[PDB]
Design a protein around this nucleic acid. Structure first.
Length: 107
RNA sequence: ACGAGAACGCAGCACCAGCUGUCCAACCUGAAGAAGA
């Protein structure tokens, strides 16, 4: 079946997880954070979180050394995050999603 | 008894690495705790 892992990410320090420099020239910085395109809310891409988490887990499950390709690291890592190896296509068990800023009203 | 039937343009990938919001600059100048008769 399918399990949904809920949670909250709280920024202890200011986070610059962005790479989008699109739309308005109303006075934006040359290095803006990635935002939701419709709601203009700051956004955490699921790819950023997935990549950072996979990197840290693969280093920790090795342990401490991560020099291999992403498709060669560990069986646990491959089954959690997916492997596109030509013969052994291991499918990701985790489906990360883009995360929007939730507590805008509190801010 | 439809040039048709069946067929996910899909799988893995951190917008990331390095970088002091720093340098120079007196809170300063003048002034009787003093005078009737």
């Amino acid at each position: 079946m399918k399990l949904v892992i809920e949670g909250t990410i709280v920024l202890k320090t200011g986070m610059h997880i962005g790479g989008s420099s699109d739309f308005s020239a109303i006075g934006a910085v040359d290095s803006p954070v990635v935002r939701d395109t419709l709601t203009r809310l700051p956004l955490i891409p699921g790819s950023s979180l997935k990549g950072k988490m996979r990197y840290l887990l693969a280093k920790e499950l090795n342990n401490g050394i991560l020099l291999n390709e992403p498709n060669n690291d560990q069986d646990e890592i491959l089954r959690l995050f997916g492997s596109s190896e030509k013969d052994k296509i291991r499918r990701a068990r985790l489906k990360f999603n883009d995360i929007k800023l939730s507590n805008l009203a509190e801010l």
